[PDB]
């Protein structure tokens, strides 16, 4: 009773435009944790999920693809960045609001908090997605101490298979699906203890977002910034047009800023829009019933310009 990879991909292409091999490897991660169901006893209690390792920049969609696969597949989700067993005790506390959010709006009394003690556990030991953001931040070189390789050691019994003791009972982990992300610009995947490199067989590399890629992320995705502002400003009683020649000057204007400062990724769009929808957001109420055309001419003279700091003339002889 679950989708096909071809469909998981296509359902992700609506909130996370771009990438590719990203979704693919993530899809087959879900698809084969289900195919694990239609099996006897021997070939079923032993077949650990092929964990994933996402290698890519910052703000390219390493966390999105892990989130839009926790709801659009429904399962306990949790993100953590390097106690260790309290990562499972939180995956369980995020199981109740599912096995009792829809079920409470379905069973209507019939409470029985004794089944959410063995039926909400099946909701974890089976459907469990643990996301480790910034895992490259715990590798051997770091130029003084190597205790970051201790965290990588306490975080081993989990990706392997142990029995975490939560307040709902003994929840196994052997079948949970772990996905770790990392920039891996300083270190390399092989800089992780070998006794855990073979517990992350899937290696998927995400790419950065170009000028055109920033153009699409601005509209195509559901609840895109173009729509979010079209709606948040429609409630004021104002309509707003986001022409296409003006979307280019917002994607190729938030990119110009990512290649001259820190590359925060897509999140650069939010800080750009907020400066654009600055003039309107304030006096929107006092301008009820008006269709404002946001084009190249408006966007251009909306923010200004952003050249590099001064680096040189300051500390260089």
């Amino acid at each position: 009773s679950e989708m096909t990879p071809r469909e998981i991909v296509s359902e992700l292409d609506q909130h996370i435009i771009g990438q590719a091999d990203a979704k693919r490897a993530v899809a087959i991660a879900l698809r084969n944790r289900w195919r694990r169901m239609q099996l006897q006893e021997p070939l079923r209690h032993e077949v650990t999920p092929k964990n994933i390792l996402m290698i890519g920049p910052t703000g390219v969609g390493k966390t999105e693809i892990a989130r839009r696969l926790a709801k659009l597949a429904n399962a306990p989700f949790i993100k953590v960045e390097a106690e260790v067993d309290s990562i499972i005790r939180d995956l369980t506390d995020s199981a109740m609001k599912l096995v009792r959010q829809q079920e409470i709006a379905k069973n209507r009394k019939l409470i029985n908090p004794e089944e959410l003690k063995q039926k909400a556990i099946d909701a974890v030991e089976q459907n469990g997605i643990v996301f480790i953001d910034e895992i490259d931040k715990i590798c051997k070189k770091s130029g003084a101490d190597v205790s970051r390789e201790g965290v990588q050691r306490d975080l081993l019994p989990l990706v392997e298979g142990s029995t975490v003791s939560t307040k709902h009972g003994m929840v196994k982990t052997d079948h949970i699906l772990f996905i770790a992300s990392g920039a891996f610009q300083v270190a390399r995947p092989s800089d992780l203890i070998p006794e855990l490199q073979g517990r992350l067989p899937i290696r998927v590399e995400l790419t950065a977002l170009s000028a055109a890629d920033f153009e699409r992320i601005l509209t195509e995705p559901h609840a895109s910034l173009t729509e979010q502002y079209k709606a948040l400003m429609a409630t004021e009683g104002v309509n707003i047009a986001f022409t296409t020649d003006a979307v280019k000057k917002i994607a190729e204007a938030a990119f110009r800023v990512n290649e001259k400062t820190e590359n925060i990724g897509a999140r650069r769009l939010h800080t750009v829009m907020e400066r654009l929808m600055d003039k309107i957001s304030f006096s929107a109420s006092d301008m009820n019933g008006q269709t404002v055309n946001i084009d190249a001419a408006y966007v251009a003279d909306a923010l200004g310009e952003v050249v590099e700091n001064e680096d040189l003339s300051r500390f260089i002889l």
Binding site: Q185, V186, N263, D311, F315, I316, L317
Partner: protein, 173 residues
């Protein structure tokens, strides 16, 4: 060593000989003194006795592949790691780095220096000999920045006893 860098007509060249000297003897004579950094985006030539000369090279890399290959920023980020309260040791060496945009010279003591108007840089014992031939050419000939680096390096190998005619040159783009 002799490491020299000329820049003419959207061209950035960086050459250096290949003699590893130990005392007054020659241990290795083919050594590559000019290496490529950031997937081939920047050129780096070093001088100053292997060890330090190298660790200075590495440290500038861990700074480029952590600042999107922004030469100038990477440079200063590195320099600032010496100009603090808790120093970063002290390196007996110096680098000549250059990409399509800028060219610099970074010392393992914590300072970054920009060329003079002519955009020529040289370092190492054979340094000034090359720098003298370079300026000579740049200011009186039409030769490409490559031809000049090539010519200047030889002039310097024939005067410096720690520089040979066995060099490796790299250019951008």
């Amino acid at each position: 060593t002799t490491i020299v860098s000329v820049r003419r007509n959207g061209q950035v060249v960086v050459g250096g000989d290949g003699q590893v000297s130990l005392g007054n003897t020659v241990m290795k004579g083919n050594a590559r003194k000019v290496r490529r950094l950031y997937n081939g985006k920047v050129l780096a030539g070093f001088a100053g006795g292997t060890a330090d000369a190298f660790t200075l090279f590495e440290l500038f890399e861990r700074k480029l592949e952590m600042h999107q290959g922004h030469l100038l920023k990477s440079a200063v980020e590195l320099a600032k790691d010496w100009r603090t309260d808790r120093a970063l040791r002290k390196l007996e060496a110096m680098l000549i780095v250059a990409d399509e945009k800028e060219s610099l010279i970074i010392t393992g003591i914590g300072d970054v220096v920009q060329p003079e108007e002519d955009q020529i840089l040289a370092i190492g014992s054979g340094g000034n000999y090359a720098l003298s031939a370079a300026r000579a050419l740049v200011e009186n000939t039409e030769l490409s920045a490559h031809e000049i680096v090539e010519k200047s390096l030889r002039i310097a190998g024939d005067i410096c006893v720690f520089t040979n005619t066995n060099f490796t040159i790299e250019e951008l783009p």
